[PDB]
Amino acid sequence: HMPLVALLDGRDCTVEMPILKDVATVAFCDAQSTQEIHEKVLNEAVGALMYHTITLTREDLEKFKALRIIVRIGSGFDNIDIKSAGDLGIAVCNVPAASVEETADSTLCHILNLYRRATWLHQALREGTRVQSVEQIREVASGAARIRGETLGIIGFGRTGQAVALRAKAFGFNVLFYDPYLSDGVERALGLQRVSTLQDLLFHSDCVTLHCGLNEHNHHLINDFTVKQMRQGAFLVNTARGGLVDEKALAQALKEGRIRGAALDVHESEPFSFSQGPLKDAPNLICTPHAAWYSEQASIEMREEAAREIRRAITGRIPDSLKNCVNKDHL
Amino acid sequence: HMPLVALLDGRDCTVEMPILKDVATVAFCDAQSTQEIHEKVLNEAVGALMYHTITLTREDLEKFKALRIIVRIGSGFDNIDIKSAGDLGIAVCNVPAASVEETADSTLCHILNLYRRATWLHQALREGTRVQSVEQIREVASGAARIRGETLGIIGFGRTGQAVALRAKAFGFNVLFYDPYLSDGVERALGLQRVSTLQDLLFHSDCVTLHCGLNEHNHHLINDFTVKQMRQGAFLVNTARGGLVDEKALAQALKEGRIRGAALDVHESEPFSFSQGPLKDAPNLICTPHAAWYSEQASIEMREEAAREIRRAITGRIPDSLKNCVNKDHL
Amino acid sequence: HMPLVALLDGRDCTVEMPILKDVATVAFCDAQSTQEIHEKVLNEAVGALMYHTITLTREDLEKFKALRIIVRIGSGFDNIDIKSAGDLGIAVCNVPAASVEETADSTLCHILNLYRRATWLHQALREGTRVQSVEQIREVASGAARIRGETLGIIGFGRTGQAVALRAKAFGFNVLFYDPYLSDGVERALGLQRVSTLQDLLFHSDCVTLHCGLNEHNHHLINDFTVKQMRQGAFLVNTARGGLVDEKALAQALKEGRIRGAALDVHESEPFSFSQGPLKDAPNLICTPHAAWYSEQASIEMREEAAREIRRAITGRIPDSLKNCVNKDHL
Amino acid sequence: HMPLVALLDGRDCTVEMPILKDVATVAFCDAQSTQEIHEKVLNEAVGALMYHTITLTREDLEKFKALRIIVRIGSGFDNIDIKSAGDLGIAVCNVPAASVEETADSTLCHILNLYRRATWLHQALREGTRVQSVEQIREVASGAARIRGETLGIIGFGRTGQAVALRAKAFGFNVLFYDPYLSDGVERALGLQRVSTLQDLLFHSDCVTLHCGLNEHNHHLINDFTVKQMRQGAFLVNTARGGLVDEKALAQALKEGRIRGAALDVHESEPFSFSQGPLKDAPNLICTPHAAWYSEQASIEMREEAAREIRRAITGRIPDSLKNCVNKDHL
Ligand SMILES: Nc1ncnc2c1ncn2[C@@H]1O[C@H](COP(=O)(O)O)[C@@H](O)[C@H]1O
Ligand SMILES: Nc1ncnc2c1ncn2[C@@H]1O[C@H](COP(=O)(O)O)[C@@H](O)[C@H]1O
Ligand SMILES: Nc1ncnc2c1ncn2[C@@H]1O[C@H](COP(=O)(O)O)[C@@H](O)[C@H]1O
Ligand SMILES: Nc1ncnc2c1ncn2[C@@H]1O[C@H](COP(=O)(O)O)[C@@H](O)[C@H]1O
Ligand SMILES: [Ca+2]
Ligand SMILES: [Ca+2]
Ligand SMILES: [Ca+2]
Ligand SMILES: [Ca+2]
């Protein structure tokens, strides 16, 4: 009788089971919350696989009586109290590399959608707008702007942020980044300008894109205060984490025109709806349902890697055998 | 009393008049056809400014009794019989450089919109789709594909085509082009692979993008025959000219899935409508109303350049003074 | 009995003969001048292969009594009177693509050799210089300069020039070019700045590199006059043609320090010697013996292509069958 | 009376003193070894500035009776026992960013010097070689190779390594790297392939370039064993640290042709001489006297930064105030 591993917030384990067949019994819960988890898993689950639709607090984690590893199928782990998980003796891991370029591609797509208004232009044709003269073109496409010379400010200069920068350079962007945790000179290897503070980044950027994890020190990084530091008519793009932005502040900025447009793949409350929330009636808003990460090859890659990480934890020694443990310090 | 210059298919001459004030009387016609042009212009117009919403055949041009220059405010001139215009002693000019990067940016936006489905994903949220689980994400975003390793086939390797290639390289595309008029070795300077025939390009390309003018030899370049030469599930993008594609052929390819998606800024009949035409009910279609060229700075640049070209023709010697005459041979 | 083809200024025909065996008798002359060509070739040679070490004037070409094609094994043809050759009914062809990237790589090597002084630094160690302290390093390497922010001015924006630009961009150069024959907007497709005149290019460039053919209108393009228009302490690089530079002017500029250094793969009189010529005692000079074009694969590629061009001329119709005829107008 | 700071292995403190004037007395020793340091500095020196020409062992550091900070004017600190320095309560710092791009430029210069033989070709002309025929060009330039398609293997994917990769991509290199300390996915952000082991890197690379620090685990990383794992006729470039290569092994590889050429800015014993050492008579060797880092702007930048770091240590709290302390763990 092998250890039990549970896919907490999902139903499909097809990609994982060929890797774990002779290692662990695999069950799933399709649970949005811990309340919806059968007590068989809580008391006996040795490992857990998990996406982004369930959050595990210290109280949620204290209900598990035998869990020793949690593997987030994906890069971000802000939905898990990793320090409490470490206190309780539970290793938390992630899969960081699978969707780096997918997300950067989705990001560039949203950046170009703002500067070129292709998505809004398509809606206008879906809604029946007639664009016959060169002069109706200019009106319907009003706001489309030349990209060369514009300044793109990247918050978070890690893997995805650097992929964004590389792509942005080819379109003629002047690319800056702000990352207060990187060592001196990372800007030089890649031929970019770096700034010391968020205020400087927002001050100089016509378009601000977010590419940092959500941690204890940057909740609502974009807030009513820091939004006033953004250039008039600036763009905001967020394919990182919804909790990084105060949507109430953003909603007002868009309504008053202080921000000309925003493209958001993530939101404070998901799933997102154009009928519920602070952006209920905000203008110049493009939204995708947390899909910037998804490609068929990326989805398979991350699930196979996560399954292997579970295998390494069961058959090996924690945390030495793990390749992407994110709470070694708290463990 | 100065020579008369007429903005044929438009109303706004504000950008042009400061340049032409002391050179020519400036009138406009706001005419979609030659039938709608007041006979005062036909008999006395010495020069003409024109966009893409009116076509001038040999018969249309023979109605002008004093015209000696036509300046297309824009790069393409397929809407003017340039060889007959030259026969009749009328120089035809264009403005090629103003929207090179704007169009390449719109093109990359449409390419990424197909590979990432951001525009379709936004529609699904506008239509009320609920995307709660990781598993509804995969379904709603089904078709989104990893770009690295994919092959982008560029038809037409001129200014816009080369800007497309440069940008595409940064996303990991394998970029080929087909241009049967360029000299030997242009592929080498830019680090790209070139193919000899359209069939080869379509054979190897997962995504085909068009960046050639519409001339007498490539009407319906993409037709029922050449569409069968495209890879199964390939992408098509067209920000060049609508006449290059047989939409009846494309409509069927999209319906049967031989082409997974198409992004079109231009169409056989403009203005485009999702309710009229061969693509009335075609799936996986993204459309923009011939706006890939438009930025505020590009629109001003092209109009000022065209006004200067008109000035050079009136005050100087034709065709020696013109900087962008496109029918010197037929003149 | 087949037509005779002669390798005029060489001995080795090994690469060409498998292609021409059943098409033409192949002889060689190893001749630096026409005076050294056996009269059998002059009177009967139907085709000719040729490198850069022999020049054919109208008088040289009038000695051939049956020649109908000349194929330059290489890109440049300034050593052939192509217009007189056309008058006499002789097609002249070249092979332009084989060494585009080789030359751009040699160019970047010479550019970096000037900015980094690696070649001069190696000489100093060959001559026995002792570099022990950080302070002898600065002295021996005195002149080495930071590249980011420097301006590279490209004269000639064709295949090699554009390959130079692409590479130069990655090192942080600000790249301009001057090419008075290209159409409007070529700078935009590639994300570069263009200037109208040679004076402007030389005015703004810290390092000037030449990548244009030698034609009737740019002999001694760099002369005593235009050298005074160069920035103080500027760099000059020439991998194009020696006839483009007045070496007497350059020698003085280097001696007086108006030019800090020059890297030359070509020269007014070849073969080059550090003991003969106007640069006999010029300082800060790096020289290579007209080898910027050479790689093993490039040398084979060009010779096979040239052999095929000869084959096409003998077995087909001139000039219709030729792929790289450079005097179709004069023919 | 202020604290004393000593430039140990140098004489020039001009750039540093305006920053330290009112903070510390500044003396210099111009010492290649600790034996040559006046005892006034040993007993009273509170801080130390230092380049790469003196090494400080535990025994050297134990002679200082009041030293509390050492600042290496430069990136590498392999010449300082940092762990013993930390044991003795001495913070060790460096200046990492000043010469990132200078070194990458020197590296690319040496890489191109090998592939293009420009430096060797210039020597041949200095030695009087006559290169008249196309056929003497091929012989004298024999070995010059086409770069597109070649594989560049980077050992060490930090700041300089990544700058090397970016530049190398533009020349057509296929760039791999090996860095066993970086997290999963760094290769993806930058569009490169990564390998797990040194053997794999050496196996696939036509040209191997070193860009890692010298630490306790990679002395003689390139040794007689690992040299046999290099591809036949491969290139080696080293602008990092001389101690990374067994020159006896390299000397033999070059003599037998297993390595076609090597470009070395650093060496096991410096200063380097072509008359002393294991490479006394090694062929196909290019050498520079540890100058890859030097530009005028880089030299000033690093000295001002180091002076500021000394100022921060004297006027602030160690190690909290330091911006580039490299032994916080051992302190
Ligand atoms: N508040 C913040 N502001 C800017 N950058 C941040 C912040 N928090 C984290 N980061 C950076 O975001 C990056 C995440 O990269 P990755 O997780 O590899 O995509 C890291 O370089 C972090 O240092
Ligand atoms: N039928 C065709 N197929 C491929 N390329 C074409 C065709 N017709 C024209 N072109 C090319 O399209 C390019 C137009 O570039 P531009 O007008 O500068 O954007 C030129 O390089 C033409 O040679
Ligand atoms: N005097 C000149 N100044 C600047 N560019 C020139 C000059 N003469 C020729 N060229 C350009 O040099 C380029 C040669 O390119 P290629 O022969 O393809 O390497 C062409 O673009 C020419 O227009
Ligand atoms: N033995 C080694 N093999 C490969 N990479 C190494 C080795 N030792 C250190 N490195 C890497 O070298 C890089 C140094 O970068 P930097 O000091 O920023 O130029 C870091 O990424 C290290 O992980
Ligand atoms: Ca703006
Ligand atoms: Ca596909
Ligand atoms: Ca200078
Ligand atoms: Ca080789």
What ligand is nearest to the CA atom of residue C189?
2
CB contact under 8 A, D189 and A323: no
Which amino acid, residue D81? D
> For residue A180, is the peptide bond before it cis, meaning its omega torsion is within 30 degrees of 0?
no
Same domain, C162 and C255: yes
What ligand is nearest to the CA atom of residue C156?
3
Task: Return the residue of A nearest to C173 by Cα.
Answer: A191
Gap between the Cα atoms of C212 and C219, Å rounded? 11
Q: Which residues contact D70 (CB under 8 A, 6 or more apart)?
A: D47, D48, D50, D56, D80, D85, D90, D91, D92, D93
Gap between the Cα atoms of C84 and C79, Å rounded? 12
Sheet holding A91-93, edge to edge: A25-28, A4-7, A45-50, A69-72, A91-93
Question: Of ligand 4's atoms, which has the minimum distance to the CA of residue D212?
Answer: 12
The conformational region for residue B236 under phi > 0 = left, psi -120 to 50 = alpha, else beta, is: beta
What ligand is nearest to the CA atom of residue C184?
2
What ligand is nearest to the CA atom of residue B297?
5
Gap between the Cα atoms of B60 and B33, Å rounded? 9
Residues of C identified as active-site = 241, 270, 290
Gap between the Cα atoms of A249 and C214, Å rounded? 64
CB distance C144 to D103 below 8 Å: no
Could you tell me the two tokens for B61? 């041009």
CB distance C48 to C69 below 8 Å: yes
D155: Cβ below 6 Å to ligand 4? yes
Gap between the Cα atoms of C48 and C92, Å rounded? 9
Gap between the Cα atoms of B101 and B95, Å rounded? 14
HSE of C186, CA atoms in CB hemisphere, 13 A: 18
| Strands B69-72 and A151-155, bridge-based pairing | unpaired
A215: Cβ below 6 Å to ligand 1? yes
Same domain, C76 and C111: no
Gap between the Cα atoms of C143 and C122, Å rounded? 15
Could you tell me the two tokens for D120? 């060797």
Same domain, A81 and A192: no
Q: Which of B100, B101, B186 sits opposite C159 (nearest CB)?
A: B186
CA neighbor of B211 nearest in space, from B191, B252, B182, B251: B182
Where does D145-246 have alpha helices with state H?
Answer: 159-170, 186-189, 198-204, 224-228
Same domain, B215 and B271: yes
CB distance D247 to D267 below 8 Å: yes
CB atoms within 10 A of CB C23: 19
CB distance C47 to C69 below 8 Å: yes
Element (H, E) at D194: strand D193-194
Which of A110, A146, A150, A267 to mutate to test binding with chain B, by most B CBs within 10 Å of its CB?
Answer: A146
Which amino acid, residue C227? V
Beta bridge partners, B273, equal B276
CB contact under 8 A, D291 and C137: yes
CB distance D293 to D102 below 8 Å: yes
Same domain, D222 and D114: yes
Gap between the Cα atoms of C247 and C265, Å rounded? 13
Which amino acid, residue A271? P
> For residue A96, is the peptide bond before it cis, meaning its omega torsion is within 30 degrees of 0?
no
Question: Of ligand 2's atoms, which has the minimum distance to the CA of residue B212?
Answer: 12
Q: Give the A:C interface size as CB pairs under 8 Å.
A: 6
CA distances from A60 to A8, A33, A80, A186 (A): 12, 9, 10, 39
CB distance B313 to B91 below 8 Å: yes
Which member of B167, B290, B303, B311 is catalytic?
Answer: B290
CB distance B65 to B42 below 8 Å: yes
Query: Residues of D numbered 1-20 whose beta carbons fall under 8 angstroms of chain C's beta carbons: which are they?
Result: 9-12
Whether residue C158 lies within 8 A of chain B, CB to CB, comes out as: yes
Query: Residues of A numbered 120-149 whose beta carbons fall under 8 angstroms of chain C's beta carbons: which are they?
Result: 148
- What residues flank ion ligand 7 with Cβ within 5 A? C 233
Same domain, A238 and A192: yes
Gap between the Cα atoms of C312 and C321, Å rounded? 6
Element (H, E) at B44: helix B39-44
Question: Of ligand 1's atoms, which has the minimum distance to the CA of residue A75?
Answer: 17
CB contact under 8 A, D148 and B191: yes
Gap between the Cα atoms of B213 and B267, Å rounded? 14
Residue A241 falls in the annotated catalytic set = yes
Element (H, E) at D48: strand D45-50
Same domain, D145 and D279: yes
- Crossing angle of helices A118-126 and B100-116, in 10° steps, is 70
Q: Which residue is associated with the tokens 């590479």? A: C167
d(CA B155, ligand 2 centre) in Å: 7
Please give the resolution of this entry in Å, rounded to 1 decimal: 2.3
CB distance D24 to D4 below 8 Å: yes
**Domains held by chain A: number:** 2
Sheet holding C45-50, edge to edge: C25-28, C4-7, C45-50, C69-72, C91-93
Same domain, B87 and B129: no
Same domain, C121 and C194: yes
Could you tell me the two tokens for C162? 């554009």
d(CA A182, ligand 5 centre) in Å: 29
Residue B36 falls in the annotated catalytic set = no
Which one-letter DSSP state was computed for residue D53? Answer: S
Whether residue D101 lies within 8 A of chain A, CB to CB, comes out as: yes
Q: What is the 3-state secondary structure (H, E, C) of chain C?
A: CCCEEEECCCCCCCCCHHHHCCCCEEEECCCCCHHHCCHHHHHHEEEEEECCCCCECHHHHHCCCCCCEEEECCCCCCCECHHHHHHCCCEEECCCCCCHHHHHHHHHHHHHHHHHCHHHHHHHHHCCCCCCCHHHHHHHCCCCCCCCCCEEEEECCCHHHHHHHHHHHHCCCEEEEECCCCCCCHHHHCCCEECCCHHHHHHHCCEEEECCCCCCCCCCCECHHHHHCCCCCEEEEECCCHHHECHHHHHHHHHHCCEEEEEECCCCCCCCECCECCCCCCCCEEECCCCCCCCHHHHHHHHHHHHHHHHHHHHCCCCCCCCCECCCCCC
Could you tell me the two tokens for D71? 């600042």
CA neighbor of B161 nearest in space, from B151, B171, B176: B176
CA distances from B242 to A274, B99, B207, D95 (A): 34, 18, 18, 58
Q: Which of D101, D136, D171 sits opposite C148 (nearest CB)?
A: D101
Which of B30, B99, B121, B275 to mutate to test binding with chain A, by most A CBs within 10 Å of its CB?
Answer: B121
Q: Which residues contact A150 (CB under 8 A, 6 or more apart)?
A: A115, A172, A173, A174, A206, A207
Gap between the Cα atoms of A244 and A227, Å rounded? 12
E strands within B230-314? 234-238, 259-264, 285-287
The alpha carbon of D42 is separated from its chain's Cα centroid by a whole number of angstroms, namely 28
Q: Which residues of C touch D11 (CB under 8 A)?
A: 133, 135
d(CA D279, ligand 2 centre) in Å: 56
Gap between the Cα atoms of C229 and C217, Å rounded? 19
Could you tell me the two tokens for A167? 């792509």
**Pocket perturbation via mutation, ligand 3, pick of C181, C211, C221, C226 by most ligand atoms within 8 A of CB:** C181
B293: Cβ below 6 Å to ligand 2? no
Q: For chain B, how long is the longest CA-to-CA vector?
A: 73
Whether residue B191 lies within 8 A of chain D, CB to CB, comes out as: yes
Backbone phi, then psi, for B132, in 5-degree steps? -100, -45
Method: X-ray
Whether residue A233 lies within 8 A of chain C, CB to CB, comes out as: no
Question: Of ligand 4's atoms, which has the minimum distance to the CA of residue D158?
Answer: 15
The full DSSP string for A238-259 is ESS-GGGB-HHHHHHHHHHTSE
CA neighbor of C154 nearest in space, from C177, C173, C171: C177
Residue D55, SS3?
coil
HSE of D194, CA atoms in CB hemisphere, 13 A: 20
CB contact under 8 A, D288 and C133: no
Q: For chain C, how long is the longest CA-to-CA vector?
A: 73
E strands within chain A? 4-7, 25-28, 45-50, 69-72, 91-93, 151-155, 174-178, 193-194, 207-210, 234-238, 259-264, 285-287
Gap between the Cα atoms of A162 and B206, Å rounded? 26
**Pocket perturbation via mutation, ligand 1, pick of A99, A176, A179 by most ligand atoms within 8 A of CB:** A179
Report CA dihedral (A284, A290, A294, A300) to the nearest 10 degrees: 180
Positive or negative, the Cα torsion across A50, A55, A57, A61?
Answer: negative
Same domain, A117 and A266: yes
d(CA D246, ligand 4 centre) in Å: 18
Minimal C-alpha gap between A214 and chain B (Å): 19
A181: Cβ below 6 Å to ligand 1? yes
Whether residue A205 lies within 8 A of chain B, CB to CB, comes out as: no
Same domain, D104 and D251: yes
Could you tell me the two tokens for D81? 């026992």
Which member of A241, A260, A267, A312 is catalytic?
Answer: A241
Residue B290 falls in the annotated catalytic set = yes
Q: Which residues of C touch B159 (CB under 8 A)?
A: 185-186, 188-189
b/e per residue, A187-218, with b = 16+ CB within 10 A? bbbbbbebbeebeebbeebbbbbbbbbbeeeb
Same domain, A18 and A138: no
Q: Which residues of B touch A299 (CB under 8 A)?
A: 138
Could you tell me the two tokens for D245? 């290569």
d(CA C206, ligand 7 centre) in Å: 6
Backbone phi, then psi, for A247, in 5-degree steps? -65, -30
Gap between the Cα atoms of D216 and D109, Å rounded? 29
Owning domain of residue D8: 1-99+294-331
d(CA C115, ligand 8 centre) in Å: 27
Could you tell me the two tokens for A28? 């799933």
d(CA A205, ligand 5 centre) in Å: 10
CB contact under 8 A, D189 and A324: no
